[PDB]
Amino acid sequence: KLPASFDAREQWPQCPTIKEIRDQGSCGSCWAFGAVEAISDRICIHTNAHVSVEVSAEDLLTCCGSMCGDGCNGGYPAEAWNFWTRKGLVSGGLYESHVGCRPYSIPPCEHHVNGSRPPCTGEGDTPKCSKICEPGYSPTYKQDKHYGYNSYSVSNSEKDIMAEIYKNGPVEGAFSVYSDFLLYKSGVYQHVTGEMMGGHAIRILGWGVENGTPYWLVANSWNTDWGDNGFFKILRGQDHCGIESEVVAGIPRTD
Ligand SMILES: *C(N)[C@H](CCCNC(N)=O)NC(=O)C1(C(=O)N[C@H](C)c2ccsc2)CCC1
């Protein structure tokens, strides 16, 4: 039933957020980024491109509080999606973009690569929850909220995750980062060297096969000069680095 390859960017060509790579900056907010990116995609898919917006990482990062975790010091993706169902999320684009209600306040940086931006440092402070949109944006904060119908776990099964993406759009997942992952440029990632650095949340938007190796198509939040234009591929079908073990998703309410 499922195709040998699937790419959400090809399936939903009128949904620009699916193609977009963000930059979490010097802040451990991957849990938030994986969520708002997939939510942005799912709102566009759910409306057949009639509503296409960058959902605010700032809003999720700053305003969830204890139920999600500890802001820039890590969080729980499951409860990020739950926050979307309970209190909703406003719009917000990239740093100094002036796009949406609450654009990201933490500046971009170079994540384990050379480039013109400053080098990323450790976990910076979590910004305050400010329930007010930026100057120049309409409508108001309350009026700009987008809500989810539900949030749920996807089972630790390759085919179930594929089915979920195929039907309902990109999902959030998490995997264990080893030091060799940081150097990723292209191909299918499999862990071959290096120690455990910690967990990392990302957006899964498809799958395929390359030179006989099955993979998941993943968006990272380390800007576009990391990896393969901000994306990477990782081995699919063996719960590699736990990539199939913490997938989470949710369906939008209609605005
Ligand atoms: C994502 N960037 C974040 C790593 C931040 C570490 N920064 C750094 N300088 O090393 N990781 C996460 O958000 C996850 C996590 O580890 N959460 C922990 C277990 C947590 C859960 C509840 S409170 C803290 C990995 C996916 C979630």
* Pocket of ligand 1 contains residue 243 by CB under 6 Å: no
* Residue whose pair of structure tokens reads 């010091």 in the numeric block: 73
The answer to whether 172 and 34 are in contact (CB under 8 A) is yes
Distance between CA atoms of residues 32 and 25, nearest Å: 12
Compute the distance between CA of residue 39 and CA of residue 48 in angstroms, rounded to an integer: 14
Q: Which amino acid is residue 245, in one-letter code? A: S
Residue from 27, 30, 44, 72 carrying the catalytic annotation: 30
Which residues lie closer than 8 Å to 73 by C-beta, 6 or more apart? 28, 123, 126
Contacts of 9 (CB under 8 A, 6+ apart): 18, 19, 205, 206
Domains of the chain: 1-255 (3.90.70.10)
Q: By alpha-carbon position, which residue is closest to atom 1 of ligand 1? A: 30
Ligand 1 and 66: CB distance under 6 A: no
Query: What is the distance in A from the centroid of ligand 1 to the CA of 130?
Result: 23
In a 3-state reduction of DSSP, which class is residue 16? Answer: helix
Structural contact between residues 145 and 252, judged by C-beta atoms closer than 8 angstroms: no
In angstroms, rounded to a whole number, what is the distance separating the alpha carbons of residues 23 and 25? 5
Q: CB burial class (10 A; 0-12, 13-18, 19+) of residue 167? A: exposed
Question: Which method was used?
Answer: X-ray
Q: Is 70 in the pocket of ligand 1 (CB under 6 A)?
A: yes
166, containing H or E segment: helix 158-168
Catalytic residue among 46, 133, 146, 220: 220
Distance (Å, whole) CA 133 – CA 92: 9
For residue 47 the two structure tokens come to 């409306």
111 lines ligand 1 (CB under 6 A): no
The CA 127 to ligand 1 mean position distance, Å, reads 17
The C-alpha angle 151, 157, 158, rounded to 5 degrees, equals 105
Backbone angle region of 224, left / alpha / beta, with phi > 0 → left and psi within -120 to 50 → alpha: alpha
Is 240 known to be catalytic? no
* 200 is an active site residue: yes
Phi, psi of 36 (to 5 degrees): -60, -30
Scanning the structure block, which residue is given the tokens 């933490």? 106
CA contacts within 13 A on the Cβ side of 75: 35
CA 210 – ligand 1 centroid, Å: 30
Cα(136)–Cα(145) distance, integer angstroms: 17
How many whole angstroms from 166 Cα to the centroid of ligand 1? 28
Tokens, residue 6: 């699937």
> Which residues make beta-bridge pairs with 75?
69
168 is annotated as an active-site residue: no
CB of 199 closer than 6 angstroms to any ligand 1 atom: yes
Q: Which amino acid residue places its CA nearest to atom 5 of ligand 1?
A: 28
Indicate the angle between helix axes 30-46 and 77-86, nearest 10 degrees. Answer: 50
N-terminal to C-terminal alpha carbon distance within the chain: 32
Please name the amino acid found at residue 136: G
Give the position, in ligand 1's atom list, of the atom nearest the Cα of 77: 27
The pick from 29, 30, 61, 175 for probing ligand 1's pocket by mutation, whose C-beta has the most ligand atoms within 8 angstroms, reads 30
Residue 227 neighbours by CB distance under 10 Å: 25
Answer for the pair 205, 15: CB distance below 8 angstroms, yes or no.
Answer: no
In single-letter form, the type of residue at position 253 comes to: R
Whole-angstrom distance, CA of residue 149 vs CA of residue 6: 26
Task: Enter the tokens of residue 229.
Answer: 């234009």
Helix (H) or strand (E) holding 210: strand 196-210
CA distance 247 to 226: 23
Identify which of 164, 229, 252, 188 has the alpha carbon closest to the alpha carbon of residue 19: 229
The answer to whether 191 and 214 are in contact (CB under 8 A) is no
